[PDB]
Structure formats: C-alpha cells, structure tokens
Structure 1
C-alpha cells in the first residue's frame, strides 16, 4: 500500500503538475498592502494559496508541519507591545519531496500582550507556509517575486470585485456521495 510520503507520481500527473506550476497568476490572486515607506507591496492571501495548493496537489497531495516556532522578542514600550515571531514550516508532497522555509510574524503597537502574541504567531506560521509553497513554482506564488511581472500587473485594467454566489453552498453536514464511496472502500 502507498501511504503519504511513499506515493510516486505517474508520468501523466507529473507532466500536468509540472506544466501547471509554470503558470503565472492573474490579477484575481494579487492583493496589495501598504507597507512602511508609502510603497505598494503585492502579496497573495493565505487562503488563496491554500486553495491553489489543494487544487494543484489534491487535498491529500500535500502536507505541512511546523518544525519550530520561536518568539524572538516581546517588548513593552509606552504601554504598547512589539512582538517578533519566527516559524519554520516544512511542506511535503505525497511522493516525499519537501521544502522548508522560515516565516516571520510581527505585531507592533497593540495594548494587549495576548493579542500581539496571537497575531504574530499566526502570521509567522502562515508566512512560512506561503514561502515554503513558493518553492514549487510560479503558480504557488514564486512569480510574485519578479519585478517584470509586477510591472505587467499594473498595466492591466483594474477588474471588478468578484461576486460569490451562495446558491450551491453546503447547508448540512452529510455528504451522501462521500459516504457511499467511503463505505464501498471498506
């Protein structure tokens, strides 16, 4: 039996994933936050990257663990807390190949110590996940590091906000097709 970490890719799946990972992301994926200095910084939201990984590899095709999370510092100044957190996140595919990266979470200027630590820890883990996933290819966020793609992104017309249709939204816990397939699997 082939469990996770021991399942070799077939030729077809390898070829499809290898071609799909080279795609660059459209403007629908790129958000912009204002960092220090008044310059526009582009990023991809964490849940978008999660959806991209779940489509590229499947829900059972990728895994990630936290190898280590370290609070670098918690400092108090004028009643406000400054917190730095680093996290090392390892992403593994079902064939066993893996990438590890460091993510950093920052909380500055909050009165609550617990809120600052919560924000910085969660941000470090998510940042580590995104940076580790970038190593697989452009479609998982590597392209966002290229200055030419960022320039080409700005010349595109600004698209309207997406509308989510909640007609086919899950409304009950039961998944009958899932239940039938699982029962037949036994």
Structure 2
C-alpha cells in the first residue's frame, strides 16, 4: 500500500531524470512585489498537476501538520491577518518533505473573508514549498537567479488555448468501472 510500496528501477530513474528538468515559460508567472520589482512564481494548480504527473494521483500525498493564525489586527476598518501552515508531502515509498507556508490578507474589511484567504493561501504556499524540495521540475529552480535571467531571455508567449471538446461531461466512467470491477 501507500508508504510501503518500493520504487522499481525504471520508475526511479524516470522520476529522477524528469525531476532534474527545469520548467518553461508555460508554467512561470509574474507578480509585482510591494516596493520591489517583478517576481516570478508557479501557480498552485500547476504544482499540483506536476506532482500528479511525476508521481501519480496515488504516488504522492500531503498533509497539514499544523496551521496556526499568527495575528489578527484591525486598523481603521481594515483587517490584517497573518497565518502560517506546515505541509508534509510523502511519496508512496515513504520519502517525505515538510515545509512552511504563509497566507496574508491585509486589505479586506471582513474578518471571515480575510481568514478564509489567509488560511487557504498558507496551506497552498506550504504545499508548494514542500514539493519544491524534490527537484527543479517541481519548483526548486524558481529560486535560481540564473534560471530567472535565462527565462527573461525567452519569447514572452501568449496564454495557451484550452480545448474543451473532450472535457468530462457525465458522471459514469465505464473505463474505470470495468477495471475496478475486475480488480476484485
């Protein structure tokens, strides 16, 4: 089962070499730091899909070790909330990485909205920072300044077009139902 199954030679080598890869502009995005300059990041769903491909839908697993709200302050109608989380990612072989993530909500005037934003942002950031420690392909290269410089030296491509023809349109999945009924 999970945590017990050991990696085969082919799977190991494939995952290792694929994890030494770096990401292309189709993954990186850009924000405007406060007082700073253009910073580069990788969106959450991007890292989630990257993990689900590298390891499988059941090859990796994450958990919230602890989430703690640091502070909640109120300045003339604005709610400032700081929240941190500790996400631990674990592979089916037993290997594991754990790291912190933070969430920040300074502008809003609704306490519930600020907390909703902060906690989810903290958990997502922690998941990103914990998946980082597996290899460049999972976000370890986003902190390599030379990698960023070489990313600036690439054509700034337009957003990719998503084809919604073969999108999921009904509940039943006979392809899965068949294999699972035969799985007993």
TM-score class, shorter-chain normalisation, is over 0.9
**Greater shift in the superposed pair: 58-67 or 32-41:** 32-41
Partner of 1:110, secondary structure, is coil
Q: TM-score, normalized by length of structure 2?
A: 0.99
**Alignment equivalent of 1:64, drawn from 62, 65, 69:** 62
Q: Distance in 1 between matches of 2:138 and 2:35?
A: 27
Aligned equivalent of 1:97, options 95, 98, 102 = 95
Q: Give the alignment of 1:8-157 within 5 angstroms.
A: 8-157=6-155
Relative to the length of structure 1, the TM-score reads 0.98
**SS of the residue 1:16 aligns to:** helix
5+ unaligned residues in a row in structure 2: which ranges?
Answer: none
What displacement does 1:38 show?
Answer: 4.2
- CA shift at 1:132, angstroms? 0.2
SS at match of 1:153: helix
The alpha-carbon deviation at position 160 of structure 1 amounts to 1.5
Where do 5+ consecutive residues of structure 1 fail to align?
A: none
1:37 deviation in Å?
A: 1.3
Range moving further from structure 2, 33-42 or 175-184: 33-42
- Residue 145 of structure 1: how far off its partner (Å): 0.5
Structure 2 residue matching 1:109: 3-state secondary structure: coil
Please give the secondary structure, in 2, of the residue aligned with 1:95: coil
| Length, aligned pairs only | 184
Deviation at 1:45, TM superposition (A): 0.3
